[PDB]
């Protein structure tokens, strides 16, 4: 059965996502306009804005505060791109195979990403990942728990206090496992926790691929200038 603390955790995670994710996408106006590396300025802005929201969600996560400032920073730096890919799915649509943000201008497709300077090597696994995630058809409760588990991972590069990080994650993991049995009906439930954890492995690969893609883009200064200072700090540095 789902313990009150577990229910408490879920309620917090939902509210935190609600605070940090605006389904109206009204802030997108502020970004540099999309041009159809024409897309890089607009996408760099979207990514940077997203990093800010991922941080805001991360603070909300139970037990996250208890971590030392250095461990919090390493966790965000490594996980930020993965969370953006994970969170981005709410936008993502099977019909177009594109991320849809309520306007044609703000609807993003493979050629747009490519215009950002990303090769199919990143993009193709990315779209399959989006497709597989959508197929899971997770409860919002599951979606928010998965983002929280992604962030608080003990094997992230630079982690000081893995045991403490592992302890925060396990409580979330146990909440997820217990939620699915209690609140997710068969046949959707079948092998759901394992499928979700497989998505986290997919994400590590995507992150590893993204880094190589960033490094190639990064190597040229003129391309680097287009990025935001947050983006340079999180991925560079």
């Amino acid at each position: 059965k789902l313990s009150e603390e577990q229910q408490h955790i879920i309620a917090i995670l939902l509210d935190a996502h609600h605070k940090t994710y605006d389904p109206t996408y009204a802030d997108f106006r502020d970004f540099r306009p999309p041009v159809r590396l024409s897309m890089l300025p607009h996408l760099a802005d979207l990514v940077s804005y997203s990093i800010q929201k991922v941080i805001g969600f991360a603070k909300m996560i139970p037990g996250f505060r208890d971590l030392t400032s250095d461990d919090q920073i390493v966790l965000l730096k490594s996980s930020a791109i993965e969370v953006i890919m994970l969170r981005s799915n709410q936008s993502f649509t099977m019909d177009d195979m594109s991320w849809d943000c309520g306007s044609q201008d703000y609807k993003y497709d493979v050629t747009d990403v490519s215009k950002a300077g990303h090769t199919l090597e990143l993009i193709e696994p990315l779209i399959k990942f989006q497709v597989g995630l959508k197929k899971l058809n997770l409860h919002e409760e599951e979606h928010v728990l998965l983002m929280a588990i992604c962030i608080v991972s003990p094997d992230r590069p630079g982690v000081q206090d893995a045991k403490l990080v592992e302890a925060i994650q396990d409580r979330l993991s146990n909440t997820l496992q217990t939620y699915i049995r209690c609140r997710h009906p068969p046949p959707g439930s079948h092998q759901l926790y394992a499928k979700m954890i497989q998505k986290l492995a997919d994400l590590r690969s995507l992150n590893e691929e993204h880094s190589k893609q960033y490094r190639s883009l990064s190597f040229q200064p003129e391309n680097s200038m287009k990025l935001t200072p947050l983006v340079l700090e999180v991925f560079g540095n």
Binding site: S69, I73, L230, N237
Partner: peptide, 11 residues
């Protein structure tokens, strides 16, 4: 830590 903006946002 060499991460001023991330550290500030975190606080």
């Amino acid at each position: 830590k060499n991460h001023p903006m991330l550290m500030n946002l975190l606080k």
